[PDB]
């Protein structure tokens, strides 16, 4: 049906594709450049302890602040933390701007993400019989019931898979499932042993040629064993348990079915539900059938949170089940987003800041900027003459790190369209002239928009 593309796979490169980890010794000391990082040895070592905090299940509701100017690698450090944890531990990134939902109060939006950052791992065994129905045969009973004339003591079903077939002897009550489900010979079904009922996947595509037209799609014969008994490990967040309880999905009545045909509007999940969910979760943890695996809620531009968000986070972080929260901020001393009379450092209320482990991120030396240019070039696949490297690094000292990382691809285009397989000073000197930085542009504004005028900028 679909025409599979045989062409080679490759990965897009984004602003942080070069970062692969925190780059630490087994002693936890930062290597001066490793895993894509250059410098920030203090902040990487601190994040390494935070990583070991998260992997140790004693933590609940601790707070971290990544504090430092724009460009200083706070986003890179958060992503590196996430990569050090890996996919088995939740990392839930948001900005403060995402909390201003129109659809529920923002303390609900934040508590959703707070519970998204908390994972639950449940182990259960799946136990089914599974195949194409090869036969159905009633076993007439030894002692029939009077007045009925028919009495069946067993129904026998043949199931085949790709890997075998079995004669299956079933309690005759399965007649109810077969008759409702309209199971026929050549249909693919499974029998689940916790009910003894059956469900029909479809007709086996071995029968796809029975007619010139039949109104169903066929399905392949199951490629497993005819009997499955498997442990299954389910990734669950506690937010999944919130929604699954607060809006049940499978309801067969008109109001349920009309509900599932209309937009699944968020609702202000009660603390009573969440607190009972916690109690049943803690029960199953004590049974040992589930693991709690708290992860990371990361809030970037946390200075976009307002004082109502921060005061709720006080209560939230005090929960006995809670992720770690990592905050990033760049806002100096600034007015609290929802308390116009109050200024504080980082734009974080002094009440709340006292809870956080602050990690400072510092600027970069000229030689670190150069090393970052080397790492970024080989990641985007660009290759530079050393004089192009030094010119890119020089703009990085004079203007900004980000601006210079953004010159690499434009200059690579200009090089290849000039027939050069590597970029040189002539291309950098050309990329930097097509693509201005904010300062040179602001100078054009300041010179041209000194007044109103037919060709003036507008203000």
């Amino acid at each position: 049906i679909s025409e599979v593309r045989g062409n080679t796979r490759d990965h897009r490169t984004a602003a942080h594709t070069h970062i692969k980890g925190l780059g630490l010794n087994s002693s936890g000391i930062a290597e001066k450049q490793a895993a894509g990082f250059v410098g920030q040895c203090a902040a990487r070592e601190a994040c390494g302890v935070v990583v070991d905090l998260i992997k140790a299940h004693k933590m609940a509701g601790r707070g971290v602040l990544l504090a430092g100017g724009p460009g200083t690698g706070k986003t890179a450090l958060a992503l590196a933390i996430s990569q050090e944890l890996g996919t088995k531990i939740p990392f839930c990134p948001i900005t403060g701007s995402e909390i201003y939902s129109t659809e529920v109060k923002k303390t609900e939006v934040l508590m959703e993400n707070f519970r998204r950052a908390i994972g639950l791992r449940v182990r259960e065994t799946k136990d089914v019989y599974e195949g194409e129905v090869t036969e159905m045969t009633p076993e007439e009973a030894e002692n029939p019931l009077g007045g009925y004339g028919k009495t069946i003591s067993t129904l026998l079903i043949g199931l085949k898979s790709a890997r075998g077939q079995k004669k299956l002897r079933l309690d005759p009550s399965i007649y109810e499932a077969i008759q409702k489900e309209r199971v026929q010979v050549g249909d693919v079904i499974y029998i689940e042993t916790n009910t003894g009922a059956c469900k029909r996947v479809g007709r086996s595509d071995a029968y796809a040629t029975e007619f010139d037209l039949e109104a169903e799609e066929y399905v392949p014969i199951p490629k497993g064993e005819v009997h499955k008994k498997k442990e299954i490990v389910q990734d669950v967040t506690l937010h999944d348990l919130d929604v699954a309880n607060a809006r049940p999905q499978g309801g067969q009545d008109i109001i349920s079915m009309m509900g599932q045909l209309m937009k699944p509007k968020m609702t202000e999940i009660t603390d009573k539900l969440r607190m009972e969910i916690n109690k049943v979760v803690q029960k199953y943890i004590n049974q040992g059938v589930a693991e709690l695996i708290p992860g990371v809620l990361f809030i970037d531009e946390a200075h976009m949170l307002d004082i109502e968000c921060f005061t709720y986070l006080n209560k939230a972080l005090e929960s006995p089940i809670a992720p770690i929260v990592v905050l990033a901020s760049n806002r100096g001393i600034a007015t609290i987003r929802g308390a116009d009379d109050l200024k504080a450092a980082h734009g974080i209320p002094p009440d709340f800041l006292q809870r956080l482990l602050i990690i400072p991120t510092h600027p970069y030396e000229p030689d670190e900027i150069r090393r970052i240019v080397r790492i970024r070039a080989q990641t985007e696949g660009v290759q530079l003459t050393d004089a192009a490297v030094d010119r890119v690094a020089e703009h990085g000292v004079r203007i900004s790190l980000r601006y210079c990382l953004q010159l690499l691809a434009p200059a690579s285009i200009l090089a290849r369209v000039n027939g050069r397989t590597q970029v040189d000073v002539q291309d950098i000197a050309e990329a930097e002239e097509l693509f201005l930085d904010a300062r040179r542009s602001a100078n054009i504004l300041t010179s041209t928009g000194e007044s109103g005028g037919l060709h003036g900028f507008i203000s």
Binding site: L65, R331, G332, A345, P360
Partner: protein, 441 residues
């Protein structure tokens, strides 16, 4: 997990004299405030008096939440203790007034008793009849003790339960006849061999003895809010949990207040009034305070406890300041508890409890240094360094947290005051309140 207050296991007072011990049940110091909270705790337990607003006041830290969490532990599970952050009240689904009304009514329990009746026996036989193409179902259960056999007719709802439970002969089952729920307790027969897919060979049990029927007195506690939600509706009682409930009309509450009183006179219910704890109460608006002040005056009002960090501070939603940031005609109705910042030996004792709760073996000099840090960086920061130094010690395989680990932790992680200096030392490179910044070296 271990949380911020997980070591708090009570208020730490002599139940006879209400004298605070200098350290017990995880609380330390605050003796005047702990005695005051113990008098409040006693008049909570006595139930006699309604609508007392008690404000716990103090600087940040100094245990105001810890005291309120100590109170909650000392009440136990039975008395309602509704924690509310004042920022929860600004719903989009309901007004602040309605959100406060629900928070009050969540804090009054109705403790309702019923005589359930239960069956427990071996299933000897099951018969089920089913209408082809659905609709009606019929059946009979034959169920046994060592001492009885009887045949019970079954309806559709019970047959749905029987088939969902996959009840079979030789199962030991119990049936709560009042709710209709079934539980399989085990089996007396072996699991058969004639059929496949029968599932789990559940626990063996001897047959139940005695009569099949037994009466069972059971007691359930429900809030006035939970009675509100199901009586404002025909359908959709999941709004108890999803929070879909709108602004419930006052006619419904006026009726419920009347009927719950009558249920008390009938002896059907006990009213168990509990606590609403409004943390960060300074975050409410003037409109909220001018609701609480008269909501308190009702016979079904809970006892309302509050905490505030604020000094003489602006009231939200108005142009002017007041003590605690709370209106004066509100504070008129409040008796205020003041908490006081800890001494170094109080800091040392708290940090020892935090260390023991986290199971961290501090060396004595590390506890001394953490105390010195506690005096100057703060109790929360000095607490954060305990779990951090434990991890650093584990990197070097140290069997105890040494001074080197606390110094290493102090180096890696800044306290608030040091971070404020770091901000002031980098005002050029951080984003200012003017939005200006310099990105260059």
């Amino acid at each position: 997990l271990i949380a911020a207050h997980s070591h708090i296991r009570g208020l730490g007072v002599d139940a006879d004299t209400l004298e605070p011990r200098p350290s017990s049940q995880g609380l330390v110091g605050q003796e005047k405030a702990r005695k005051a909270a113990a008098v409040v705790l006693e008049m909570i337990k006595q139930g006699k008096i309604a609508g007392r607003a008690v404000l716990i006041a103090g600087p940040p830290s100094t245990g105001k939440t810890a005291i309120a969490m100590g109170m909650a532990q000392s009440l136990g599970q039975d008395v309602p203790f509704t924690t509310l952050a004042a920022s929860e009240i600004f719903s989009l689904e309901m007004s602040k007034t309605e959100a406060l009304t629900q928070a009050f009514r969540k804090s009054i329990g109705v403790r309702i008793k019923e005589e359930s009746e239960i069956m427990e026996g071996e299933v000897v036989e099951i018969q089920i009849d089913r209408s082809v193409t659905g609709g009606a179902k019929q059946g009979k259960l034959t169920i046994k003790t060592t001492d009885m056999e009887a045949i019970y007719d079954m309806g559709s709802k019970m047959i749905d339960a029987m088939t969902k439970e996959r009840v079979m002969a030789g199962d030991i089952i119990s049936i709560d006849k009042s709710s209709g729920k079934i539980t399989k307790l085990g089996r007396s027969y072996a699991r058969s061999r004639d059929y496949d897919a029968m599932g789990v060979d559940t626990k063996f049990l001897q047959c139940p003895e005695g009569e099949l029927q037994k009466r069972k007195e059971v007691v359930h506690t429900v809030s006035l809010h939970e009675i509100d939600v199901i009586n404002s509706r025909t359908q959709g009682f999941l709004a108890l949990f999803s929070g879909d409930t709108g602004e419930i009309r006052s006619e419904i509450r006026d009726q419920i207040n009347t009927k719950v009183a009558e249920w008390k006179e009938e002896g059907k219910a006990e009213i168990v009034p509990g606590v609403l704890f409004i943390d960060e109460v300074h975050m409410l608006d003037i409109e909220c305070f001018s609701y609480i002040n008269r909501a308190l005056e009702s016979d079904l009002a809970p006892i309302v406890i509050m905490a505030s960090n604020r000094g003489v501070s602006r009231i939200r939603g108005t142009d002017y300041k007041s003590p605690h940031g709370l209106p004066l005609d509100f504070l008129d109705r409040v008796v205020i508890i003041n908490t006081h910042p800890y001494t170094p030996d109080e800091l040392r004792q708290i940090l020892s409890i935090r260390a023991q709760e986290e199971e961290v073996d501090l060396t004595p000099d590390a506890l001394a240094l953490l105390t010195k840090i506690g005096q100057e960086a703060g109790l929360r920061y000095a607490s954060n360094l305990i779990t951090t130094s434990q991890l650093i010690a584990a990197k070097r395989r140290a069997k105890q947290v040494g001074v080197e680990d606390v110094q290493r932790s102090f180096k890696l992680f800044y306290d608030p005051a040091r971070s404020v200096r770091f901000v002031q030392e980098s005002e050029k490179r951080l984003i200012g309140n003017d939005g200006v910044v310099d990105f260059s070296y």
